[PDB]
């Protein structure tokens with residue numbers, strides 16, 4: 001089954017270099033080209049470059065002086081490397097598989113989940129997680145004072161999915177992000193079931209589980 | 215003579231508010247509408263809003279929720295206020311005078327020099343200025359470790375103009391900016407004439423005059 | 429450098445109506461091999477983009493018959509009949525006939541549905557947070573439509589300003605609703621100064637404002 | 645909302661040549677009152693935009709005869725009969741027929757002139773800077789064309805990487821050349837560990853790469 005998954009450093013300081021790997025599964029790089037596409041916060045998709053099945057590359061005009069794409073067919077990995085990072089370069093970076101056609105693809109059938117690069121001189125900080133305490137009952141977790149984006153939040157290790165709202169983060173005046181995740185549940189179950197929010201902040205390697213009680 | 219000149223805080227923290235004043239001279243605001251236009255670093259002009267002569271306003275769609283424009287006809291001042299500042303809002307802001315037509319202007323004939331707004335949680339830092347000691351001789355000043363933009367550089371209080379190159383600042387991994395100004399001068403004059411670079415950084419209220427000797 | 433112009437930028441459409449998105453190229457995107465490589469992608473909230481249409485008019489596998497692409501040369505249209513809640517997101521056209529390939533600016537599709545009043549909840553700061561020096565009081569507006577909503581903080585009936593932040597989700601893929609959080613942030617000291625914390629909410633689905641409060 | 649589509653994004657043009665910049669609107673910008681409020685602005689390096697053309701084809705005062713605007717409905721052109729050095733900048737079209745008004749994306753005019761090799765200068769760190777514990781070494785490439793240049797840093801012939809930054813001016817409005825600074829930054833400790841500091845410059849105007857160096 002076809003998968004693509006991007007891996008990168010999360011946070012890079014301005015002027016320095018960025019390396020992202022895209023690991024691919026269920027097809028061979030010797031047979032398919034792969035595009036790199038970026039999305040800056042709140043903006044549109046931008047095509048960054050392509051490495052074709054035979055290994056030749058083409059690049060975005062605006063970035064090409066600072067950009068290289070390469071790959072390792074045997075390892076099913078495609079690498080993007082960019083020098084002299086600017087604040088501008090802050091984006092979610094995606095790799096995408098070609099589909100159809102011979103020299104020119106018909107489309108990009110499969111995309112990775114993306115990886116969030118923040119270009120900043122600040123340092124990583126893991127989040128503080130505080131409970132938002134309870135026919136219908138709302139409960140939540142306040143995920144405060146972390147940097148950079150992103151944080152993922154789940155409930156009961158993913159068993160609870162319906163009625164979950166994880167709000168977009170807000171950037172505070174301290175330069176740190178905060179958000180809250182809420183879940184809506186039956187009040188009757190506030191005595192029988194435990195509710196834990198699982199919070200993951202990859203850039204700080206921080207994982208927090210918080211039990212939320214009345 | 216028509217003049218417009220924007221004034222603002224230089225650096226604003228995220229989530230907080232931006233107030234800018236455009237002070238106008240040589241025409242009456244009772245008679246002319248004024249536009250605000252902004253320019254994000256390396257990007258194009260974006261129209262922000264208008265306050266018409268009679269005082270009604272119209273806004274950019276993306277920004278209308280967080281934007282107000284008002285004025286004081288008697289003071290010759292136009293005011294832009296924006297809430298909930300996001301990193302995105304970093305830009306040079308311009309006010310521009312209407313010209314032509316009655317209800318819709320034909321163009322914007324006079325523009326201010328612009329004011330630079332950086333949205334950041336970092337604090338202001340004044341630059342360190344170091345000399346770059348020398349039939350053509352090059353000399354300069356290294357204007358290092360400041361935040362935010364801009365710095366202004368002149369030579370010999372503005373008397374020296376030909377052969378001056380003030381380079382676009384570069385953002386360092388420390389998150390501070392650095393730039394150099396160089397001037398090309400006759401080698402014969404190195405014994406006779408003094409060369410002083412006058413460096414100004416308004417957000418820190420720093421003003422340096424550095425003599426650059428051999 | 430071929431430019432793709434996508435309009436409109438945002439497209440509110442009622443459930444079950446037709447949406448029509450336009451993409452114009454700065455030059456012909458008919459390749460010299462006779463193909464025209466125009467694609468339409470949909471990026472749903474919190475998702476990677478997904479391929480809908482390739483070669484102007486061909487549906488990718490799994491793409492419902494409601495989506496149709498057409499056009500030629502420099503002028504192209506995506507049409508979605510009977511718009512559904514799941515169609516919500518940002519549509520991009522993309523051109524691969526010319527190097528470099530280019531995306532359009534995107535079209536945000538917003539679903540217009542019937543009015544839904546929010547449920548309102550208020551949450552006191554946790555004791556943990558207070559003992560680290562700050563008080564965050566959260567007001568939640570859950571599952572409403574339309575997006576526009578008024579949230580006012582009052583502390584001992586004093587109307588608060590400048591000390592709160594609002595976050596709104598993207599529209600929901602199943603019921604086309606929004607939710608909103610409003611966070612009132614205070615020093616521990618200032619928080620322990622007052623008794624009543626009230627979140628006051630105005631919305632079009634409500635016949636009057638709804639206040640949710642607690643006593644510290 | 646109306647999108648204004650400007651092409652090309654960049655326009656390298658030889659001194660003395662013709663230039664033509666296109667602006668297309670996503671819909672007619674003919675106002676219901678019959679006027680078409682299309683303007684062109686030029687923003688030079690270091691400067692605020694200035695009005696060139698208004699109402700499609702009318703030259704603003706001071707604007708040389710060389711500039712002319714034409715077109716109608718949705719399709720407009722700025723032309724320059726004999727491009728000069730001072731015409732360097734970013735041209736923007738602008739529409740005020742429809743609310744909200746909108747700028748095009750810009751067309752960057754770059755001037756193509758003859759080859760000019762750089763003059764190369766190296767500056768050691770100032771004594772003043774050393775006194776604060778940092779060592780910046782600056783290589784200056786002055787007045788060259790074209791923009792493409794390579795600057796390598798060598799310390800006792802050990803090629804450097806990762807510890808320097810370049811800045812390049814905008815193209816000059818009088819002779820259409822560029823200048824470029826490369827700054828090598830080292831700790832004072834590390835600077836005082838090595839003798840030979842070399843700036844090595846490659847450029848089309850030079851017969852071979854030129855090294856400028858000094859001994860600490």
Ligand SMILES: Nc1nc2ccc(NC(=O)CCCC(=O)O)cc2[nH]1
Pocket residue numbers: 035050098103104105107108523524525526527528529
């Ligand atoms: N997902 C995609 N990545 C790319 C990269 C490049 C594309 N197009 C071309 O290279 C056009 C070349 C035309 C020619 O054959 O001369 C098309 C494309 N689509």
Ligand SMILES: Nc1nc2ccc(NC(=O)CCCC(=O)O)cc2[nH]1
Pocket residue numbers: 249264312318319321322739740741742743744745
């Ligand atoms: N420099 C400029 N600022 C503005 C602001 C608004 C402009 N145009 C309109 O408001 C057109 C409205 C047309 C109508 O509805 O009659 C035009 C304009 N030009």
